[PDB]
């Protein structure tokens, strides 16, 4: 059994990984060594890390940027599996999403790649839903509008969102309890609360509960995209292995008041005209997690929502139909859990492949 070191296993993402691994009994297929940054082995002890065959870290980019270089320099030839974005774009690093790019991964191992990094949550969740179309070579480009959850920003962000929602209701607790109060008076109070100085907004820098934030991460002055939107085009193509002939994936990344699921509205420009039924089949057949949701109201309300998807490995995709722009224009909406396929799952899966 391979000796695997775990770093950052107590963080939010790291905790989801430990749970999923335990749930699947992955620990009986490997020898785990747990590291810590607290003053268990020290996550900063290069000598100890070099004894390992594989290192799985959910610690973050700063840690990776500090330790990874030192360890590689020792001559260490083991595998580094990372959830952080730090090494995704390195030429000696492969972004993993095995249900989608198992071939890229297989060839990469054969090539001697020793670094595998999970991809951006929005991109991996998109590929898990729409992967069938890319596999059949049908996508020319994709216009994206996201509805991203707080978990992407962090645990304290999730907490702030919950606190905000609580205070908004509290502002009109009395008014709401009597069925005949003025709804406009109620919103004046809620909105006044949202704009108040004591309204907790330090994590987001703006209210999220009862609102939305059309900006995620930093701006890349050169394109005008935020880093989050930039990863859609950059990461989608590196994952699929189309960096030299990249497929345009761009849009706006917006944060909404949800906890763990990212939702995305798509305008997909296909290369050819196909029957809707054929398109649906191509999508549903790609993997066992995607779930095609019929374009029906009651079914959509029950299946295509964060309420339904949270904490599950299911990737529903629905509202599938042709758009007014042309028969080659397809509309689609998907919902997926940010902490699972968007974070811990690709890492848990590549790990299982490395220790088999």
């Amino acid at each position: 059994m391979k000796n695997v070191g775990f770093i950052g296993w107590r963080g939010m993402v790291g905790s989801v990984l430990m749970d999923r691994m335990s749930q699947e009994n992955d620990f009986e297929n490997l020898n785990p060594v747990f590291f810590t940054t607290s003053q268990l082995k020290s996550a900063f002890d290069i000598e100890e890390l070099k004894k390992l065959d594989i290192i799985v870290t959910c610690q973050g980019g700063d840690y990776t940027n500090e330790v990874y270089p030192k360890l590689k320099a020792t001559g260490w030839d083991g595998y580094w599996v990372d959830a952080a974005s730090a090494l995704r774009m390195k030429d000696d690093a492969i972004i993993v999403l095995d249900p989608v790019n198992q071939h890229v991964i297989s060839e990469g191992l054969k090539k001697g790649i020793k670094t595998f990094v999970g991809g951006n949550c929005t991109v991996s969740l998109m590929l898990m839903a729409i992967g069938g179309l890319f596999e059949k070579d049908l996508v020319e480009w994709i216009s994206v509008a996201t509805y991203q959850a707080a978990s992407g920003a962090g645990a304290k962000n999730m907490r702030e969102l919950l606190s905000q929602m609580g205070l908004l209701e509290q502002a009109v607790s009395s008014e709401l309890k009597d069925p005949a109060s003025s709804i406009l008076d109620i919103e004046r109070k809620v909105t006044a609360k949202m704009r108040a100085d004591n309204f907790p907004t330090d994590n987001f820098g703006a209210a999220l509960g009862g609102s939305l934030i059309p900006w995620i991460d930093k701006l890349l002055p050169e394109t005008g995209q935020t880093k989050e939107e930039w990863k859609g085009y950059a990461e989608t193509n590196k994952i699929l292995g189309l960096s030299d002939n990249p497929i345009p994936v761009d849009g706006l990344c917006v944060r909404i008041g949800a906890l763990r699921c990212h939702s995305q509205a798509f305008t997909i420009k296909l290369k050819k005209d196909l029957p809707l039924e054929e398109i649906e089949q191509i999508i549903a057949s790609h993997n066992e997690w995607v779930k095609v949701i019929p374009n029906d109201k009651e079914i959509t309300l029950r299946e295509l929502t964060p309420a339904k998807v949270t904490g599950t490995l299911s990737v529903p995709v629905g509202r599938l139909r042709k758009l007014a722009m042309g028969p080659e224009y397809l509309a689609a909406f998907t919902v997926g859990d940010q902490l699972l396929w968007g974070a811990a799952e690709p890492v848990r899966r590549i790990l299982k492949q490395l220790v088999a």
Copy 2:
């Protein structure tokens, strides 16, 4: 002075209208006669209505389809101003948004048009934001992704939303106050509450607070769009007077946890390659309400949100940049109040013109 009858002036939309008219002292330029359905004239007394010059109704579609044809039959020669969607697509009716279609309105008045209806909130808020691009005949098509407020659905929906948010927080109130509590334990509890049978979801048919619903109104079998999405193509063009040579407008209408502001993500295909700076100038110049928000984080966070725009007549538009598909592909995000330009304001304005 013109004798104007008001119906539904006590409902949410009618109340905004009444408040706005008071704020602008519109009642000084007309003789108001208020109607009621309670057992002040009766909203159903066709003889009373027939004595007025204009009828302004925010009562709703069922009322209009009941009384309107019956009053028109008495030979009534006055004007019918409606906030409901019932008559929007009638050939003897014009959808009003004067800052955008004053010419269509003016021509219609001279022609003898007697029925003026406010337009769909999403289409109106969209045109108030990028009306400059249509004005310049620069739009080839537009794919839309909306983040719609509860107010669009109704007053009780706003209340359900606020109540859902309160419950979600109350389910983890003590844990949230504990700075060392597990975020995963907190989410597990919030999510359980959201799925509880007793979670108030009768108005939306699903959870909205902490989630989203990618479906608004009824399905339109013919195209697969919901009626809300269908209005994009139908109403955008009727408002602009382009029903004979339609511009494609389509996308996905999604409901989120906001009280009264609709937000929209746009992918706009322009007819020519224009510098971004030029495009912003074209957008900012169309009307006095649209506000171009520079593509900067801090300004965007403070200006382009429901939190900022709620209850105001401002229609900010930002995140403007060229998309990866090409220099003729424009990204844009806007936020607008659903009850003002989306409902009462276009009605308030056409009435001012009718009583001049």
